[PDB]
Scaffold this active site. Structure first.
Site, short mmCIF file in Angstrom:
data_model
loop_
_atom_site.label_atom_id
_atom_site.label_comp_id
_atom_site.label_asym_id
_atom_site.label_seq_id
_atom_site.Cartn_x
_atom_site.Cartn_y
_atom_site.Cartn_z
N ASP A 1 47.33 73.14 63.31
CA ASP A 1 45.92 72.96 62.89
C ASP A 1 46.11 73.10 61.23
OD1 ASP A 1 45.09 71.83 64.83
OD2 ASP A 1 43.27 73.32 65.10
N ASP B 1 27.70 36.05 32.10
CA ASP B 1 28.89 36.08 32.87
C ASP B 1 28.38 36.62 34.35
OD1 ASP B 1 31.63 36.21 33.43
OD2 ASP B 1 31.91 36.32 31.37
N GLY C 1 39.24 38.01 42.84
CA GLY C 1 39.11 36.77 43.63
C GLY C 1 38.91 35.54 42.95
C1 PMR Z 1 34.79 28.25 23.12
C2 PMR Z 1 35.78 28.81 23.86
C3 PMR Z 1 35.40 29.93 25.13
C4 PMR Z 1 36.01 30.93 25.19
C5 PMR Z 1 36.37 32.06 24.26
C6 PMR Z 1 35.98 31.11 26.77
C7 PMR Z 1 35.83 32.30 27.67
C8 PMR Z 1 35.04 32.34 28.55
N1 PMR Z 1 34.57 31.35 29.09
MG1 PMR Z 1 35.21 29.58 28.95
N2 PMR Z 1 35.38 30.19 27.10
C9 PMR Z 1 34.55 29.63 26.18
C10 PMR Z 1 33.71 28.68 26.26
C11 PMR Z 1 34.05 27.74 27.38
N3 PMR Z 1 35.07 27.71 28.19
C12 PMR Z 1 35.05 26.72 28.79
C13 PMR Z 1 35.02 26.57 30.30
C14 PMR Z 1 34.13 27.51 30.87
C15 PMR Z 1 33.26 27.60 31.95
C16 PMR Z 1 32.72 26.37 32.87
C17 PMR Z 1 33.17 28.78 32.39
C18 PMR Z 1 33.32 29.59 31.43
C19 PMR Z 1 33.46 30.88 31.35
C20 PMR Z 1 34.00 31.65 30.25
C21 PMR Z 1 34.23 33.21 30.37
C22 PMR Z 1 34.14 34.17 31.40
C23 PMR Z 1 35.07 34.20 32.47
C24 PMR Z 1 34.54 34.92 33.86
O1 PMR Z 1 33.79 34.18 34.55
O2 PMR Z 1 35.34 35.72 34.47
C25 PMR Z 1 34.37 33.70 29.24
C26 PMR Z 1 34.40 35.02 28.26
C27 PMR Z 1 32.86 31.07 32.82
C28 PMR Z 1 31.63 31.97 32.54
O3 PMR Z 1 31.28 32.61 33.41
O4 PMR Z 1 30.75 31.68 31.60
C29 PMR Z 1 29.51 32.21 31.86
C30 PMR Z 1 32.73 29.84 33.23
O5 PMR Z 1 32.06 29.61 34.35
N4 PMR Z 1 34.08 28.59 30.48
C31 PMR Z 1 35.01 25.71 27.83
C32 PMR Z 1 35.04 24.29 27.99
C33 PMR Z 1 36.21 23.37 27.56
C34 PMR Z 1 34.49 26.25 26.89
C35 PMR Z 1 34.49 25.81 25.40
#
Ligand code: PMR
Ligand code: PMR
Ligand SMILES: [Cu+2]
Lengths: 400, 419, 419, 400
Positions: B36, B274, B409
């Site tokens: 134990d 985000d 995920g």
């Molecule tokens: C301008 C460029 C840029 C950068 C720094 C990222 C990172 C980033 N972009 Mg993504 N992104 C930006 C904006 C946009 N992103 C693109 C795509 C996309 C979308 C639809 C999404 C996203 C996102 C992200 C993300 C978060 C990634 C995450 O959800 O884990 C950042 C910091 C993400 C989010 O949740 O935004 C609210 C998400 O759903 N971006 C596109 C279209 C071509 C642009 C211009």
């Protein structure tokens, strides 16, 4: 005060050895917590050991507990048709309750046979320590084995499947006749024991096992245990001589693995040269390990500790082990820790409970629980054994 | 009997062992069979205690069964006092020694040890680990804590933190920082980081702070009954719970409510663009009751999650958990069986599982993002880093820990779609 | 004209943004084509910054590129002062505006804005983002910081921390705690916590603390010459580096060290028998030079790892990385190309890899445990929780972050084997 | 100041539609950083876009730059022989250099023309912005599509494969007109366009594609765009009127999709009844967005802002749109953000750059960058479209 685990700890690797065996521990919540904590990640894989907690009514009424156990094993058989051999494991509260696990195992082997065979062995700490759990399991298997009339070699011990494969291959290409293993994976593959059948011992703690096979007429092979290089050679040499194999044939058999074992040992023993090792009684593996470290790894031994010495089986290793290291057999952590502090050993083989505390006080520690788990026996893994003992020293040298 | 493979709580003596390990100068003498001693491997390895647990085991065998048991207990207690020089001693029994003809009381008091000896009566087969931790701390308080003239300035006691507790070490620091900012100096933290002198000084505090009800509720109620100390009823896990705890503690002490929200980032990070995908995520919650209630509040009010399941393995806290679950429009899951929790998870199919290590593994088999929020944990869970669950920095830790599985995920699924 | 898919650093104007965004009251207009707005949402989302980045693009198009570029820049500067009310203005050009024949200095000087205006000349195609940040901070210092009188108490300046930096916030907090324990008060933290008044006060500090050489070495050297301010040459990442930093800063200030090592847990957790499997594990390291050097020291001396790869994407810091890698018996991998690092990882086959986000993804495809230690990071990498890389608590953060991949992989492998 | 992206961001969702297209951006480091940042996770999955950085040596001269571009295209073709339509995308530095991307396309479509058909279109922010990049990519491919002599309806506009599949399935259920979507996933099944074929947009911003297909001889059919139940219903009604499908069969084929779309829109819009929406000019989806939110979702739009409001092709959608909301052409982001401050709208559909600051100030924010990505067209995704706006308001209500 002794720092050992009750024999239920051996269950987790016994059930990895035996795919067909389930280990039903009739114990309290304490023994279930032991199994869970010791297993760790293992319990999340749905393993084959389970504990039936003796409830207050169970300790109150023995007959009610017996009926409950019958219903438990019935439900276990229903849940798992795959289990063909079931191990009713005694425990400390079970022993104090004094319910007859042997009468039980008889009853359920009678009313669940011929498919399911139920054995009884005691892993209770009151009469069992770390590896005597596996020793007692194998001792429980022996009487039910068939009485054979054809001479066969029986390897006794929980060799890991790769280590079992290496030993079996080395023997079969050595020139022996039949080789069988007592911890057979399935009940159909259970070995035969008779007056003419011989057996050789792989791991030391199988004292009660050796006593069990002695009664059925099986005769012991006096060999050192196949831990490193020479320990393995002497093992295979005794086996060959009892099987009558010519010495030159055996040398041609073992020369090739011997060189690689020597090279692997020498590669990892460089940190252990000119060092002192201390063995706290953990698993009855320590005299042989001290022999391996002193002769092969160039490590001085200040004291080898064993839960209880079985001099007959362990004689060859003690003879090989130098007269200098003093063998202690009593387990008493209070004075044993003072002995460790006085000795100031470079490496201290102790339990996992004492490992971190002795590490804090300035002592490099190795935990002997890793030996039963990790494949360390035979030639290919001799370097692994040496590295296992040398890694803590390397870590201390790096960490300053 | 039932065929158990995983128990959420250990035997009751493990709780007393945790209490003894937390304190300094207190030694546990346990009438237990050899073997134990495994419970010392939790503290030395999982908690990484550089010192051995302050526990001595009689370690009796078949030979020491008939009459040698009492002599072994007496010798073990005396030798423990001589070797370890504890300022006080607690004596108890294991599951095996309950059936053994064991007299802890008489054997302990016959040796006439100069230091106070605390006698423990724990029903091993009936109760569980948290009862052991609570009752041991309570009995320690009765033996040592006496009514005493209060401190000149406002003082508080942190009641509840024990060894092998989930993030107790960091929560002590966080709550101490909060109280110091509020102008309240922590008189003593017990059981962990305490001594028998500290337990004696417990009477000096103006009020008691119950960080962990599981191991300190009984001590808090006894202090209310005898030492005349009110005890806080809010556990400060989450921003809202932290503010409620701050307000209630300021009311208790009479000082102004002053909380440092500069480090707080969880509300802004949740309100960010985000975190929109977090809205409506179904979360299943399990573990000890306090953490589950607090985590459900955090999820619903601050994280945007909808709580799809609630539960606890603490029968002693079934009523508060059932009340909370009714609060979130659910029925609580008060079971100690991992099969029932697994069945509830499978039926519910939650998007995220916050629970114990067993719940983490269940989610891993079911492919659900998982985080650990409750007591049953591995060596892995205990941080080397400062990872509180309480306070504002603890809220930050909660946010990051709960998002991390969802982020992993989402990232994996995104890179799977992309290629 | 080599095809580029992934860049470890951005254009220098992104670095200029990382300086202006950190400072309060410093807005900068920047000659850019309509569409360079993408760079502000880096701070908006990756850093989760509520404040809009203090940047005013001109946003010229084909209808304004002929001759209206100067007019657009003049209007941008006018409006920026008129409504943004900056305490100081900094001025630069984007790559497209670098090609277009514009003069940022002439227009800003002709506007004669009463607030000070700093003029940036950054070679866009030749140089990179870290050069942009370092040069921007340098010019801000030369414009604002002037030889001044020293403070009464011993004061230091944390030079280097900028926006969009790896863990810069928590490292500022940790170094500030160490310095407060030493007795040294931080005069100013620039550029992230600074204002133009703080840049003016930079002359008051007794010595400079160079937390991040990449963004602060030029400012440190210019303060060494013009301001007669010695600066620290060691970076406090890891316990050994932290103790060296404490010793050297105590020598500079003249005070005693008072290292606060109560929080320290990584040395004991490494010395524990759990961390025995860590010995000799092969680690590949990439990222910016400071973090890679510090991580190599931590992995070798404090973690018992065998460093098999050392590299940096800062070609400007190739010499110190080359010397450090020669220290470990390796050749530094100084490249800005992710394919070369890919090849090095494939040939080397490390057991663990610590580097950038690209490094982590490379490990994910290659199936190796991965942790992030350097500047190119994702939005998820910025933590709400207190996650320093510096000091004694940063050592614990480092240990836990680096252990988590190995522990996760070991647990997964064991679970698969037992299944 | 225009807080909008340059047309290179259109590449990121275009190449998911075109599995055989590689978008080689000829630009500085800034545009490569744009592509990497906006791809985010995608750049770690071997994307099909790459930026050829122009160095100071590359800037000087045109013939040398053309030779280097040819060498880079050959290097790309060696690595990726699969690609058979390369999209040389002009950028801002490329446009200032005046590198004749049309001449480069002419040369490289003669080098390896039969397999790799090299296209060119401007993605420069000085010329094109956000989805203008996508419509420019589609306007670069139309002039080189083969002529046809069979009247066919074509789905101009890049849509997700699921949305495309349901669009073509609905048009098949209409019974008249086999469909050939203009974006070809590979050059292998490239479609045909001529005076025979008739085209209808699915996404509002394809004005350059209107010009290309109008010069081809195809004629535009004006219809509200498929954003919500009513939008797709009127879109398919215009399709049926153009193809002479009787009203009864159209009602029969769209009775059930309209039912599910209306149910989903109501369920997701319950949180948006009696709310106010503001549109910051991002991607010209906003007039149709405002219509859908105004009638189907119950919002009231204080302003609908569009970077380029092509009246002729958006006309039916503004006709559906109420007279209340104001229409904004061009962006003055400071003035527009001040207007957002003054209005205090319940939800502000704005760019990602302003998305977090607006919430920090106290305004709920939805971002249309997600809208260009997420499937939100036709009947089934009507609920998803409504819920995408619903979620921010729900989160604001939950959090405080
Ligand atoms: C301008 C460029 C840029 C950068 C720094 C990222 C990172 C980033 N972009 Mg993504 N992104 C930006 C904006 C946009 N992103 C693109 C795509 C996309 C979308 C639809 C999404 C996203 C996102 C992200 C993300 C978060 C990634 C995450 O959800 O884990 C950042 C910091 C993400 C989010 O949740 O935004 C609210 C998400 O759903 N971006 C596109 C279209 C071509 C642009 C211009
Ligand atoms: C029952 C005593 C105990 C407990 C609380 C655990 C947890 C734990 N036991 Mg496991 N284990 C202890 C020791 C032993 N465990 C068992 C098995 C096992 C081994 C082989 C290993 C291990 C270990 C562990 C672990 C660490 C888990 C790890 O990271 O692997 C703890 C805390 C682990 C370790 O020592 O790391 C170097 C390791 O490799 N235990 C057994 C054999 C039956 C015992 C009694
Ligand atoms: Cu993880």
């Amino acid at each position: 005060q002794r720092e050992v685990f009750c024999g239920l700890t051996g269950i987790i690797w016994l059930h990895r050895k035996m795919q067909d065996a389930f280990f039903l521990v009739v114990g309290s919540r304490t023994c279930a917590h032991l199994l869970q904590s010791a297993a760790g990640v293992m319990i999340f894989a749905e393993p084959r050991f389970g504990t039936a907690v003796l409830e207050e009514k169970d300790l109150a009424g023995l007959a009610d507990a017996n009926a409950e156990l019958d219903r438990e094993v019935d439900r276990l058989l229903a849940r798992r048709p795959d289990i063909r051999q079931l191990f009713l494991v005694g425990s400390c509260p079970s022993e104090v309750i004094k319910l007859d696990l042997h009468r039980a195992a008889e009853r359920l082997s009678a009313h669940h046979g011929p498919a399911v065979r139920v054995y009884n062995f005691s892993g209770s700490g009151i009469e069992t320590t770390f590896t005597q759990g596996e020793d007692a399991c194998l001792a429980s298997i022996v009487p039910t084995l068939p009485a054979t009339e054809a001479r066969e070699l029986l390897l006794v011990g929980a060799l890991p499947d790769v280590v079992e494969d290496q030993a079996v291959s080395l023997l079969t290409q050595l020139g022996i006749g039949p080789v069988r293993c007592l911890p057979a994976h399935h009940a159909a593959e259970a070995p035969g024991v008779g007056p003419n059948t011989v057996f050789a011992l792989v791991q030391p703690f199988l004292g009660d096992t050796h006593g069990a096979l002695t009664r059925r007429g099986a005769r012991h092979i006096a060999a050192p245990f196949p831990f490193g290089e020479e320990g393995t050679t002497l093992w295979l040499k005794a086996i060959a001589d009892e099987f009558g194999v010519s010495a030159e044939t055996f040398e041609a058999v073992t020369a090739a693995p011997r060189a690689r074992a020597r090279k692997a040992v020498a590669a990892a023993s460089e940190g252990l040269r000119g060092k002192s090792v201390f063995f706290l009684p953990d698993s009855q593996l320590e005299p042989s390990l001290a022999r391996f470290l002193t002769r092969e790894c160039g490590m001085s031994a200040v004291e080898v500790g064993t839960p209880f010495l079985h001099r007959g089986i362990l004689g060859p290793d003690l003879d090989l082990l130098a007269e200098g290291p003093v063998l202690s057999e009593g387990q008493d952590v209070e004075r044993q820790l003072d002995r460790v502090r006085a000795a100031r050993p470079d490496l201290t083989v102790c339990g996992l409970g004492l490992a971190n505390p002795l590490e804090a006080e300035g002592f490099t520690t190795k935990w002997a629980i890793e030996l039963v788990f990790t494949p360390v026996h035979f030639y290919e893994q001799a370097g692994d054994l040496a590295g296992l003992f040398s890694r803590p020293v390397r870590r201390r040298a790096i960490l300053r | 009997m039932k065929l158990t493979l995983w128990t959420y709580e250990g035997p009751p003596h493990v709780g007393a062992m945790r209490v003894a390990t937390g304190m300094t100068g207190m030694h546990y003498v346990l009438h237990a069979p050899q073997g134990d001693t495994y419970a010392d491997l939790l503290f030395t390895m999982i908690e990484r205690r550089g010192k051995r647990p302050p526990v001595s085991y009689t370690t009796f065998q078949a030979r020491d069964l008939g009459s040698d048991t009492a002599e072994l207990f007496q010798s073990a207690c005396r030798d423990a006092y001589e070797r370890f020089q504890p300022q006080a001693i607690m004596v108890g029994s294991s599951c095996t020694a309950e059936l053994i003809q064991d007299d802890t009381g008489g054997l302990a008091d016959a040796l006439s040890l100069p230091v106070p000896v605390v006698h423990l009566e724990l029903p091993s087969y009936q109760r569980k680990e948290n009862f052991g931790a609570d009752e041991s701390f309570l009995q320690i308080c009765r033996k040592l804590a006496r009514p005493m003239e209060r401190t000149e300035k406002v003082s508080c006691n942190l009641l509840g933190p024990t060894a092998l507790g989930f993030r107790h070490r960091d929560d002590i620091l966080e709550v101490t920082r909060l109280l110091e900012g509020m102008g309240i100096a922590v008189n003593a933290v017990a059981p962990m980081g305490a001594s028998p002198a500290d337990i004696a000084r417990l009477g000096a505090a103006h009020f008691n702070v119950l960080l962990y009800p599981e191991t300190g509720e009984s001590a808090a109620r006894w202090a209310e009954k005898t030492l005349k100390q009110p005890y806080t009823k809010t556990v400060p896990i989450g921003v809202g719970a932290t503010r409620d705890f701050v307000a209630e503690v300021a009311a208790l002490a009479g000082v102004a409510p002053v909380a440092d929200d500069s480090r707080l980032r969880q509300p802004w990070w949740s309100a960010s663009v985000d975190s929109t995908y977090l809205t409506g995520k179904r979360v299943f919650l399990f573990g000890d009751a306090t953490h589950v209630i607090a985590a459900a509040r955090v999820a619903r009010d601050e994280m945007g999650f909808e709580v799809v399941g609630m539960g606890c393995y603490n029968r002693e806290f079934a009523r508060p958990m059932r009340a909370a679950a009714k609060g979130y429009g659910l029925e609580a899951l008060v079971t100690d069986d991992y099969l029932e929790v697994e069945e509830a998870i499978q039926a519910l199919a939650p998007e995220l599982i916050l629970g114990t290590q067993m719940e983490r593994h269940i989610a891993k088999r079911l492919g659900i993002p998982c985080a650990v929020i409750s007591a049953p944990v591995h060596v892995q869970d205990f941080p080397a880093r400062y990872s509180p669950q309480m306070g504002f920095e603890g809220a930050n830790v909660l946010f990051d820990t709960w998002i991390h599985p969802l982020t992993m995920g989402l990232e994996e699924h995104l890179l799977t779609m992309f290629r």
